[PDB]
Amino acid sequence: PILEKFCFTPHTEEGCLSERAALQEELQLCKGLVQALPSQQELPRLLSAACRLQLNGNLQLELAQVLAQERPKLPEDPLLSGLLDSPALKACLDTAVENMPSLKMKVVEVLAGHGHLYSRIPGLLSPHPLLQLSYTATDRHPQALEAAQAELQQHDVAQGQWDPADPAPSALGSADLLVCNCAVAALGDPASALSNMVAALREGGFLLLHTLLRGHPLGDIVAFLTSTEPQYGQGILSQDAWESLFSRVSLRLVGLKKSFYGSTLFLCRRPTPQDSPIFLPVDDTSFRWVESLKGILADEDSSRPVWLKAINCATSGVVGLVNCLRREPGGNRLRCVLLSNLSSTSHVPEVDPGSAELQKVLQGDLVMNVYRDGAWGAFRHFLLEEDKPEEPTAHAFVSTLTRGDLSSIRWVCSSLRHAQPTCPGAQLCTVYYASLNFRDIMLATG
């Protein structure tokens, strides 16, 4: 069975990867070397080599190239791929999948030779039972990404040629999702590349982009390096710079995951032609609103969206309802707004048509909009840790979890936690030593 946990996921999250230490240890190392101009990780090794040749006046050419660094191992650095391995990527991908008129998705990557998102994105989407995907990897040069063709082939991927700077080829056409990963790969120009991408993106699609932020420690550190390659330096921009660039191309930011070490993960959605949105209270306890929705949804000729809003209870189950109706005919229009707050103290916003927050969410145009304790997000599915849980217990017994596998023997919590000591026939006894007999071995071996 596929085991997952249904948890709230705020749209914007900052300081995502604070819990990890290896990332923090790497950051402490990196800042140490940079100070005044030591580990198995690639980026610290590169910094050490760069500072080794010269303490001052380091050559740009020498630090650009060195043995053990010419491999595209920069993404392999735990700092570089911290957010991709974190559940932020899954959250963004699930948000992209949910907001889709059909049940088929078309995603085209750019600069996959260095982005290496093809090796991670398709796997995260296996849990979806019915979703059918089309993944294609595009790069400027045919030899680029010529390696690992077995990795590409084992997944239903398609080769490409598109250069972000120049216009997109028609083969890609109107796609649902565009993954860039500018953090490691080098774009020709922010403005031009984004303009071409949004030109390729269908009406109402998404643009998932991963990049390192200027004005932050790691961003500045990478800025100091890579001085030989100007394109890479172009990709690194301040957060406000990225936000300003986004508006210029008529693209609206719906999601933004920000790691503590400066990394960011944007999710931008192409606006769809605006239309007058219907509104329907769905909080009546007699279900009389069902008739209204039945009539409203009946007129399939109309294309106006329907916004079921429940603001009178935190236990309204509109999420499952919109999930179910979206599969039914006419369900491409359904959208939700739910105010579920778990704390009495926390305030309740106003979702009046004139209100500003309703305007913001409408600009977003996202199916699920849940407001839980001062933040907007939606419920998302995350695979839970495989390791079995444990706890301290004075009572526990040895048991072979997998019959006939001596390597499966482990201590398990015993029922002797609950017992009565008064009964003379009970006589609970502590165990200091226990013996093994032929019978025990026969049971263990199976």
Side-chain angles (χ1 to χ4, degrees), residues 256-272:
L256 174 151
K257 307 281 183 180
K258 195 181 301 317
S259 179
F260 78 116
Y261 64 86
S263 184
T264 186
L265 187 51
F266 300 119
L267 188 68
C268 320
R269 189 179 189 264
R270 185 177 179 182
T272 187

Side-chain angles (χ1 to χ4, degrees), residues 267-289:
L267 188 68
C268 320
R269 189 179 189 264
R270 185 177 179 182
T272 187
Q274 174 59 219
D275 188 326
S276 181
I278 304 291
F279 279 81
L280 185 136
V282 75
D283 266 327
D284 306 332
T285 189
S286 301
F287 295 88
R288 296 189 65 81
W289 52 260

Side-chain angles (χ1 to χ4, degrees), residues 123-199:
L124 300 171
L125 270 62
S126 86
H128 284 281
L130 310 177
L131 174 63
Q132 56 279 30
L133 190 65
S134 72
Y135 205 99
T136 180
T138 74
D139 204 344
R140 302 170 183 180
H141 324 292
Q143 79 294 20
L145 192 46
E146 75 193 357
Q149 296 299 106
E151 286 75 349
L152 272 73
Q153 279 289 314
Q154 58 159 356
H155 302 284
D156 55 331
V157 305
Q159 309 296 146
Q161 173 58 33
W162 177 28
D163 168 9
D166 72 0
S170 62
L172 310 181
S174 61
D176 180 76
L177 189 67
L178 260 65
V179 300
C180 176
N181 200 356
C182 184
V184 303
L187 284 170
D189 170 83
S192 305
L194 272 73
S195 53
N196 287 275
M197 286 180 199
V198 66

Side-chain angles (χ1 to χ4, degrees), residues 32-173:
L33 285 169
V34 176
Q35 289 291 71
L37 286 71
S39 297
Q40 313 184 252
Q41 281 73 341
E42 185 265 3
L43 171 60
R45 185 181 295 184
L46 163 57
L47 267 66
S48 79
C51 291
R52 188 71 51 72
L53 297 173
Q54 303 188 24
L55 174 56
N56 308 126
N58 289 105
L59 310 187
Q60 69 294 335
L61 179 144
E62 82 189 8
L63 65 87
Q65 176 278 313
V66 60
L67 61 86
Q69 272 66 16
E70 293 293 328
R71 306 171 293 176
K73 193 170 179 180
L74 281 163
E76 308 301 337
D77 191 63
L79 308 174
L80 270 288
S81 66
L83 274 161
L84 298 180
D85 294 333
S86 82
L89 185 60
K90 172 57 160 296
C92 291
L93 288 174
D94 299 330
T95 308
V97 165
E98 171 173 49
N99 278 304
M100 292 197 317
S102 174
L103 195 57
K104 172 165 63 54
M105 190 174 176
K106 177 184 180 58
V107 61
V108 310
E109 175 165 8
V110 292
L111 281 67
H114 298 84
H116 303 150
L117 281 182
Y118 59 88
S119 61
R120 178 159 23 250
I121 303 290
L124 300 171
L125 270 62
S126 86
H128 284 281
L130 310 177
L131 174 63
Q132 56 279 30
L133 190 65
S134 72
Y135 205 99
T136 180
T138 74
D139 204 344
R140 302 170 183 180
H141 324 292
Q143 79 294 20
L145 192 46
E146 75 193 357
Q149 296 299 106
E151 286 75 349
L152 272 73
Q153 279 289 314
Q154 58 159 356
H155 302 284
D156 55 331
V157 305
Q159 309 296 146
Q161 173 58 33
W162 177 28
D163 168 9
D166 72 0
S170 62
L172 310 181

Side-chain angles (χ1 to χ4, degrees), residues 398-410 412 443-445:
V398 179
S399 173
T400 182
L401 278 296
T402 306
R403 166 171 158 86
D405 188 2
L406 286 180
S407 180
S408 56
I409 291 166
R410 290 187 62 82
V412 183
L443 273 72
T445 301

Side-chain angles (χ1 to χ4, degrees), residues 414-437:
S414 192
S415 58
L416 301 188
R417 302 173 70 166
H418 317 319
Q420 66 283 17
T422 186
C423 291
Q427 201 65 69
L428 191 62
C429 293
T430 300
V431 186
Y432 285 56
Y433 300 70
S435 309
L436 293 173
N437 291 277

